[PDB]
Amino acid sequence: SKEKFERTKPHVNVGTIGHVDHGKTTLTAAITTVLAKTYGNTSHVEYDTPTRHYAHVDCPGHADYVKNMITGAAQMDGAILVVAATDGPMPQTREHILLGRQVGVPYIIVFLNKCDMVDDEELLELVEMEVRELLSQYDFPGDDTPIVRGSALKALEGDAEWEAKILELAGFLDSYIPEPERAIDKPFLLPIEDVFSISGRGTVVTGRVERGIIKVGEEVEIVGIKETQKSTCTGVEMFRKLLDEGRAGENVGVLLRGIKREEIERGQVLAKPGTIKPHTKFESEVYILSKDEGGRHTPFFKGYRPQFYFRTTDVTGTIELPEGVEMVMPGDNIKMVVTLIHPIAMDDGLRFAIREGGRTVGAGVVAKVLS
Amino acid sequence: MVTIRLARHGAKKRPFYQVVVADSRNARNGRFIERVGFFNPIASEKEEGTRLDLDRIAHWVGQGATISDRVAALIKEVNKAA
Amino acid sequence: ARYLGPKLKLSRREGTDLFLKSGVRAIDTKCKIEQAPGQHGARKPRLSDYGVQLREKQKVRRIYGVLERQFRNYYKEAARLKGNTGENLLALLEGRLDNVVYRMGFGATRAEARQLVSHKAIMVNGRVVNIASYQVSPNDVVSIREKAKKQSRVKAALELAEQREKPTWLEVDAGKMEGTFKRKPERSDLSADINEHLIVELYSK
Amino acid sequence: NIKSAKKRAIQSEKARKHNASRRSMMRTFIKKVYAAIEAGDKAAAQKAFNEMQPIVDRQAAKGLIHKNKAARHKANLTAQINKLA
RNA sequence: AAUUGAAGAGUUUGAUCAUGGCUCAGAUUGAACGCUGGCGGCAGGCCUAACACAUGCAAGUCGAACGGUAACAGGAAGAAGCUUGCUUCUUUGCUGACGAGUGGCGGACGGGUGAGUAAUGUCUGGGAAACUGCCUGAUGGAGGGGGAUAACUACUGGAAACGGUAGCUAAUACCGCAUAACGUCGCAAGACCAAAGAGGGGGACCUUCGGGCCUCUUGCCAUCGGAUGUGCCCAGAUGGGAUUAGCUAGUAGGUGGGGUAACGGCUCACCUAGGCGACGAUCCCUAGCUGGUCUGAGAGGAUGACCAGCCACACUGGAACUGAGACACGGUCCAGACUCCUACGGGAGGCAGCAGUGGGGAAUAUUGCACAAUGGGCGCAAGCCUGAUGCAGCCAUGCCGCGUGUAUGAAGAAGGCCUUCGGGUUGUAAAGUACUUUCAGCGGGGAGGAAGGGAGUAAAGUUAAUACCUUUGCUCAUUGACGUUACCCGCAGAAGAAGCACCGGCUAACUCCGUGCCAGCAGCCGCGGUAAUACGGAGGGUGCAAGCGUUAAUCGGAAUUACUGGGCGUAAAGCGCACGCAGGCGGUUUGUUAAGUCAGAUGUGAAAUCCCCGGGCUCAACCUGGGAACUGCAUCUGAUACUGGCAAG
Ligand SMILES: C/C=C\C=C\[C@@H]1O[C@](O)([C@H](CC)C(=O)NC/C=C\C=C(/C)[C@@H](OC)[C@@H](C)[C@@H]2O[C@H](/C=C/C=C/C=C(\C)C(=O)c3c(O)cc[nH]c3=O)[C@H](O)[C@@H]2O)[C@H](O)[C@H](O)C1(C)C
Ligand SMILES: Nc1nc2c(ncn2[C@@H]2O[C@H](COP(=O)(O)OP(=O)(O)O)[C@@H](O)[C@H]2O)c(=O)[nH]1
Ligand SMILES: [Mg+2]
Ligand SMILES: [Mg+2]
Ligand SMILES: [Mg+2]
Ligand SMILES: [Mg+2]
Ligand SMILES: [Mg+2]
Ligand SMILES: [Mg+2]
Ligand SMILES: [Mg+2]
Ligand SMILES: [Mg+2]
Ligand SMILES: [Mg+2]
Ligand SMILES: [Mg+2]
């Protein structure tokens, strides 16, 4: 809160969701150190590339942390698959790539650690070919993707070769990730993802601005679980730096006045007044396929109670279908009505995720609202 | 020190000033000794609104009451002795 | 917050010559007006006490357009003053500017007079006022500004004014839309359709 | 802070030193006068009173304890000495 | 023309009366909650945790005190890349100014909180034993000196806080001398004890050719007084408890010393053994007090929201210094807790200031703008700053005002509901025709808060003087955050703005459907066991209205603590009886005292607030002028009927 941030080199979000205990934290720390040297839980570090300013999100690679990882990847603009070159693909890596494809991460860069732990020039190529084949078979891009090999912990050790290699890694990261599209057309909207309580400052809510801008001193409305209320913003900041306005697409922390830590939970949205209204039941078309798209095999019936993940959080919901469909067997391209317990401010065209038993069943697009 | 000054008592956007002999150790709205009169800023300049006691002012000046800028200005506005 | 809504039902709730709408469209006892005959028409439960006093207060308030709190303030002022509390209260009610306009004729109805006073169709002593609660003093003059002259609003009101009788204290010329208010009325000239000491008893309760 | 309290504190300390020295020397002079009085002498007591009077009156005029304080001790000392002298 | 003054109802019982409590009808608040919500004016906004605090700011000013120059506007001492007019370097410490530092003043005021405190507090009425910078009037003086010491230099301990070494070192800092009155001591005699001189014009007198000197602005040393803010003492009053009856020996007093700016056990040594207490001593609990506020016709009861006076406090506690003025609210030292920083050698901190955060709570504010006006402190003065203050934000928290429209129209349509099946009903309600456009909203014009002060000058005093300065006016510019000012004028259209509670009696308001002592309402009476005007819903009416209901607290009705204004045989209540002290009252007559009582007069009862007569904000809310009142208190003089002191019967 002592640095006046300059809105140059537009913000781009990059997230590392690589394999567990394969060097994600070490890799991001090494990247930050080498960039700050040559240029002068979800860990949100930042670094200013000469091309663009990036915010690096090291997400937890644990399966049980998938719920917050969903927002971390939806938050994310470019994925970094961090994997060891001595073990190759893993079930955890496959789950992570499936989640990334289901959340819609366009650009992914593969990094191969433990390059020097292997005294050969064929095993590294074999594992690179294997991961490339995995990407090409799991609906991912192919030979037009920069694949990065090298050591993630020696990048911090005194060297020159690996420093140059990681600098080249950062270069094509910023090359392969062009200027992203921002949605500052509609009024301001920001889904909440974390809450902090600053002693002497107050409560601050973190998140990626979905749309619109936030000027210092603007009135906004909290809409979400069990509550729709009003508030005032004072002191827009980003990564402990002074800001003047907050564009859309970057993870920022907005300071709210008259906010209670227990009263405000994750799942709500800070919108412009009179824009969106929370609803508990709405009509949506489902896009489940027969068997090979996450959906189950046996022809289940009504009363299904899945979690409907949204931009922020999820909630257990019920589904009702119009007459003409005796069963709700997988293969549901039809429209139905979904009722949720916790009301969340929603708009037409919203894309949500249907999940159950730790696996995604199908997608859904909001068609109408029944309040 | 003992001095004659003005104290504000009117409502918001409609001030009202009372001229009074008060020790400087007190506040504007604080205590005083003897009231001298009033000077209305708006003054509703058809009727009255300016009433000072020059005899009491002179008596207190003789004893050592330091005249203030506003009191002297009001005296010059109305008259030296009229 | 001036009262707004039905008026014939409001009048028939009590049943009196309170006053009527300025326009007339078959104002008579056609079939059911205030004492509806035929198969029903229970008009008065005949409440023992304090009920007629409440009804008198309500009819007084709805005639003059004043609210309960302001009416009670006027009653307190009248009790504080000398003379009779009821006549002092009636004097304040008539001194209310809207009733002055209505009794001068520029207001077709009392609600219309209040509307004009709010819309600045009235001036006092050569000064505009947009308060229907202003109290006029004796020996004064109240004029209508040039903008309100061209109102079919006012033309109809002045036409309807001369069908009634005229008061003891108002003298108005329509060649200039100006009226002189000379003295204050009394119970003798005021309509004897209500009792004042019952109202005095009620709020002294 | 750079407030005037620090300068006020050091000025108060210096004034404390000076006033303590002056008060201590005055007290020693008064103690010598009292010792001369109680010893039984009559001319040396008068001489000590006449020696202590100028310094105490000078300090009172400078204004460090009190003019009335100086007057009271002078009165007490003269009332003591004149009884036997 | 300045308290003209008072409501009851239900409930014991098969019914009556009385006693007796319970409940309700009214105001009112720092209110909270639920629903709803358009605007403006005024006021208010941690009652609980005197719980703990991030961060920013709230007390600096003065070069007309001083040695100085780190600045740098730098003309200028000098030089120039010499853009054909003024640009650049050590800047000569050199001017205006200014970093620190010495020095004077306020930082003891402005502001905030009731923790503590039952009288050391506060209000009222009295006094002497004392002080007082700044404000003043008078009387007098400002002479010559000496020595300190800061900055600064360099060495250098430390991350910082702060340091040692030698002087440079100046004064309005400090210290002797000239002195000693109107001052202090002392009966005098005598002794003692004082200053600081700074800024400016420069005629000229001399001329360190600035200067003394003609001089003005002053400031300073002492005394005598006023004003002022105080310190001290006394008398009355100011909560509960006797399931709180003795307390105290520095305690009561005296004799002397010391101490205090002054009295005094304030303290010391001695002596006397008292002092306080049944009118409540001592002890326990609680508590800021007052003007006032609420409720009352009144006496009374509750309380100290806003504001004003006073007191006390500043993490808890103790202590002292400076300073006239503190045991110090943004001075100092120390014990304890807590927190923070550290290089682990060692340091800092106390938001009951403005805001703001964590916790508590039924619950309460923005980390804004400005010295624009007043005031505050500093200074020749311009000028500095002020979280005092003024304005701005949010909240219907309370008061006031305005607006959602006005006539139409019988078609007594639509649709909802009821019906003795005719009809009624929400219901003139809507559409319409004429509009007005208040106030929202859009666009323009636009008063005032502004009195001052400053630059020139005309006249008067000062002096050879018109120098210099001051005072009475005239020309010149300015001096607003509020403030898209208030307001006014135009703009399309009613177009953009109503809810809450209740409807069996208390109390203003009636029908239907369904449940069927179930679900359920409620303050009471009391409902609800198939037909509920009482429950839930619906229709329709009533009471208030941007506000309606529940709850929280005080009084009233409660004459239900009753003095005005209760009762004790059977409703609660005569001690089981007698004696008797303190205490309360007291037969008849005279004289005398003026105590109680009555009369007259004085001062006073702060201001503020209630009230009366008026005035200005569009009337009001609100503000303000005058008057009365604040029934109190003390003093001076009379009255002697009554109670009482004294003397006689
Ligand atoms: C994953 C949960 C959270 C997502 C959040 C939301 O997802 C979304 O709502 C999203 C809507 C597109 C969503 O609902 N995703 C969440 C839910 C739905 C899942 C989406 C997308 C799919 O389509 C049906 C998606 C995989 C789809 O398959 C296509 C190809 C298939 C790939 C193979 C893997 C799959 C399945 C598979 O079963 C499979 C296999 O066949 C062989 C072997 N082994 C396998 O395991 C293509 O790759 C498309 O991408 C939006 O992306 C939102 O932006 C969001 C981020 C808020
Ligand atoms: N030998 C070797 N070890 C590596 C390399 N990259 C990462 N690691 C190891 O990965 C560990 C860090 O894992 P971490 O990032 O904390 O786990 P993650 O966050 O779940 O991915 C370190 O202890 C390294 O030893 C590499 O290139 N070579
Ligand atoms: Mg308080
Ligand atoms: Mg003594
Ligand atoms: Mg207390
Ligand atoms: Mg503080
Ligand atoms: Mg009573
Ligand atoms: Mg009573
Ligand atoms: Mg009784
Ligand atoms: Mg009995
Ligand atoms: Mg007996
Ligand atoms: Mg017995």
- Provide the 8-state DSSP code for C175: T
3-state secondary structure of A178: coil
Q: Does A92 sit in the ligand 2 pocket, CB within 6 Å?
A: no
Whole-Å CA distances, C57 to C62, C63, C83, C203 = 9, 10, 20, 10
- Structural domains of chain A, ranges and CATH numbers in brackets: 8-180 (3.40.50.300), 183-277 (2.40.30.10), 278-370 (2.40.30.10)
Which are the contacts of A156, defined by CB distance < 8 A and separation ≥ 6?
Answer: A26, A29, A30, A33
The two three-digit tokens of residue C196, written as one number = 């004042």
Domain boundaries, chain D: 1-85
Q: How many CB atoms lie within 10 A of CB D2?
A: 6
Q: What distance in angstroms lies between residue C23's CA and the mean position of ligand 3's atoms?
A: 62
Residue A77 CA to residue D32 CA, distance in Å, equals 94
Q: Does A311 sit in the ligand 1 pocket, CB within 6 Å?
A: yes
Q: After which residues is chain C broken (C to N over 2.5 A)?
A: none
C96 close to C66: Cβ distance less than 8 angstroms: yes
The two three-digit tokens of residue D65, written as one number = 């304890």
A149 close to A112: Cβ distance less than 8 angstroms: yes
Residue type for B49, please? G
Q: What is C134-155 written as a DSSP string?
A: PBPPTTEEEE--GGGGG-HHHH
What element of type H or E holds D32? Answer: helix D4-39
Mutate to test the pocket of ligand 1, among A293, A338, A346 (most ligand atoms within 8 A of CB): A293
User: Taking Cα atoms as reference points, which of C37, C2, C41, C33 lies closest to residue C17?
Assistant: C33
Residue B29 CA to residue A317 CA, distance in Å, equals 66
3-state secondary structure of C101: helix
Q: How many CB atoms lie within 10 A of CB A367?
A: 15
The two three-digit tokens of residue D43, written as one number = 């001319």
Q: Which of A25, A86, A234, A318 is catalytic?
A: A25
B74 close to B39: Cβ distance less than 8 angstroms: yes
A203 close to A259: Cβ distance less than 8 angstroms: yes
- Provide the 8-state DSSP code for C182: -
Instruction: Specify the pairing of strand A278-286 against strand A335-345.
Output: antiparallel
Q: Please, what is the end-to-end C-alpha distance for chain C in angstroms?
A: 27
| Residue range D1-85 in CATH 1.10.260.40 | no
Q: Please, what is the end-to-end C-alpha distance for chain A in angstroms?
A: 41
Active site residue A279: no
C191 close to C14: Cβ distance less than 8 angstroms: no
Residue type for A302, please? K
Is A4 labelled a binding residue?
no
Q: Does A22 sit in the ligand 2 pocket, CB within 6 Å?
A: yes
Q: Which of A21, A87, A159, A244 is catalytic?
A: A21
Q: What distance in angstroms lies between residue A269's CA and the mean position of ligand 8's atoms?
A: 60
Q: How many CB atoms lie within 10 A of CB B6?
A: 23
Q: Nearest-5° angle of CA D11, CA D14, CA D19?
A: 120
A238 close to A253: Cβ distance less than 8 angstroms: yes
- Residue burial B9-31, b: 16+ Cβ < 10 Å; e: rest: eeeeeeebbbbbbbeeeeeeeee
User: Taking Cα atoms as reference points, which of C127, C106, C86, C88 lies closest to residue C170?
Assistant: C106
Q: Nearest-5° angle of CA A300, CA A302, CA A307?
A: 85
Is A116 labelled a binding residue?
yes
Residue A192 CA to residue A263 CA, distance in Å, equals 13
3-state secondary structure of A211: strand
C92 close to C5: Cβ distance less than 8 angstroms: no
User: Taking Cα atoms as reference points, which of A219, A217, A221 lies closest to residue A236?
Assistant: A217
Length of chain A: 371
Which nucleotide is at minimal CA–C1' distance from B26? Answer: E109
User: Taking Cα atoms as reference points, which of B80, B8, B68 lies closest to residue B41?
Assistant: B8
Q: Does A24 sit in the ligand 2 pocket, CB within 6 Å?
A: yes
Q: Which of A9, A28, A56, A62 is catalytic?
A: A62
Count of helices and strands (H, E) across chain A: 5, 21
The two three-digit tokens of residue A85, written as one number = 């070159």
Active site residue A234: no
Active site residue A25: yes
The two three-digit tokens of residue D20, written as one number = 């303590």
Residue C137 CA to residue C120 CA, distance in Å, equals 20
Is A61 labelled a binding residue?
yes
A264 close to A195: Cβ distance less than 8 angstroms: yes
Q: Does A23 sit in the ligand 2 pocket, CB within 6 Å?
A: yes
Residue A205 CA to residue A251 CA, distance in Å, equals 10
Domain interval for residue B34: 1-81
Residue A239 CA to residue A251 CA, distance in Å, equals 9
Rg (CA), chain C: 18
Mutate to test the pocket of ligand 2, among A114, A153, A165 (most ligand atoms within 8 A of CB): A153
What is the greatest pairwise CA distance in chain B?
37
D61 close to D68: Cβ distance less than 8 angstroms: no
A57 close to A13: Cβ distance less than 8 angstroms: yes
- Residue burial A58-96, b: 16+ Cβ < 10 Å; e: rest: bbbbeeeebebbbbbbbbbbbbbbbbbbeebbbebbeeb
Task: Encode C19-76 in three state secondary structure.
Answer: CCCCCCCCCCCCCCCCCCCCCCCCCCCCCCCCHHHHHHHHHHHHHHCCCHHHHHHHHH
Residue type for A276, please? I
What element of type H or E holds C94? Answer: helix C85-95
Whole-Å CA distances, A3 to A6, A54, A237, C113, C120 = 9, 17, 10, 65, 58
Residue A270 CA to residue A220 CA, distance in Å, equals 6
The two three-digit tokens of residue B3, written as one number = 């001095």
Residue C23 CA to residue C9 CA, distance in Å, equals 17
Tell me the backbone φ, ψ of residue C58, rounded to 5 degrees: -65, -45
Tokens 């366009």 appear where?
Answer: A106
Q: How many CB atoms lie within 10 A of CB C111?
A: 19
User: Taking Cα atoms as reference points, which of A150, A15, A142, A155 lies closest to residue A74?
Assistant: A15
Which are the contacts of D66, defined by CB distance < 8 A and separation ≥ 6?
Answer: D60
Tokens 């050969």 appear where?
Answer: A120
**Integer distance in angstroms from CA B40 to C1' E307?**
21
Residue C144 CA to residue C176 CA, distance in Å, equals 8
Q: Which residues pair with A300 in a beta bridge?
A: none
Residue of minimum CA distance from atom 35 in ligand 1:
A293
Mark the nucleotides of strand E covered by protein, meaning any atom under 7 Å from a CB.
6-7, 38, 41-43, 53-55, 59-61, 101-104, 106-107, 109-111, 130-131, 133-136, 162, 174-177, 183-186, 191-194, 221-223, 226-229, 257-262, 307-310, 321-324, 328, 330-332, 351, 356-359, 366-367, 373-377, 388-392, 399-410, 412, 420, 422-429, 434-439, 448-453, 472-473, 488-490, 494, 498, 507-510, 541-546, 606-607, 611-613, 615-626
Residue A50 CA to residue C183 CA, distance in Å, equals 90
Q: Does A151 sit in the ligand 2 pocket, CB within 6 Å?
A: yes
Q: How many domains does chain B have?
A: 1
Residue A47 CA to residue A171 CA, distance in Å, equals 13
* A73 Cα distance to chain centroid: 2
What interhelical angle do D4-39 and D67-84 show, nearest 10? 10
Q: How many CB atoms lie within 10 A of CB D37?
A: 21
3-state secondary structure of A164: helix
**Integer distance in angstroms from CA C134 to C1' E620?**
8
C101 close to C111: Cβ distance less than 8 angstroms: no
3-state secondary structure of A161: helix
**Strands ordered across the beta sheet of A278-286:** A307-309, A351-356, A359-369, A278-286, A335-345, A317-320
Residue D30 CA to residue D22 CA, distance in Å, equals 12
A111 close to A18: Cβ distance less than 8 angstroms: yes
A191 close to A312: Cβ distance less than 8 angstroms: yes
Which nucleotide is at minimal CA–C1' distance from D73? Answer: E185
Atom of ligand 1 nearest to the CA of A73: 56
Is A241 labelled a binding residue?
no
Q: Please, what is the end-to-end C-alpha distance for chain B in angstroms?
A: 28
3-state secondary structure of C173: strand
User: Taking Cα atoms as reference points, which of A43, A162, A151, A141 lies closest to residue A97?
Assistant: A141
C49 close to C197: Cβ distance less than 8 angstroms: no
C106 close to C158: Cβ distance less than 8 angstroms: yes
Tell me the backbone φ, ψ of residue A335, rounded to 5 degrees: -100, 145
Active site residue A62: yes
Residue type for C175, please? G
3-state secondary structure of A174: helix
Q: Does A21 sit in the ligand 2 pocket, CB within 6 Å?
A: yes
Q: Nearest-5° angle of CA C153, CA C158, CA C162?
A: 150
Q: Which residues pair with A252 in a beta bridge?
A: A207
Which are the contacts of A188, defined by CB distance < 8 A and separation ≥ 6?
Answer: A209, A211, A212, A213, A214, A218, A220, A270, A271, A272
Q: What distance in angstroms lies between residue A59's CA and the mean position of ligand 3's atoms?
A: 50
> If you measure CA to C1', which residue is closest to nucleotide E435?
C153
- Structural domains of chain C, ranges and CATH numbers in brackets: 7-93+190-203 (1.10.1050.10), 94-181 (3.10.290.10)
**Strands ordered across the beta sheet of A12-16:** A43-48, A53-58, A12-16, A78-84, A107-113, A147-149
User: Taking Cα atoms as reference points, which of A174, A195, A56 lies closest to residue A107?
Assistant: A174
Residue type for A314, please? D
Atom of ligand 1 nearest to the CA of A353: 14
**Integer distance in angstroms from CA C187 to C1' E539?**
43
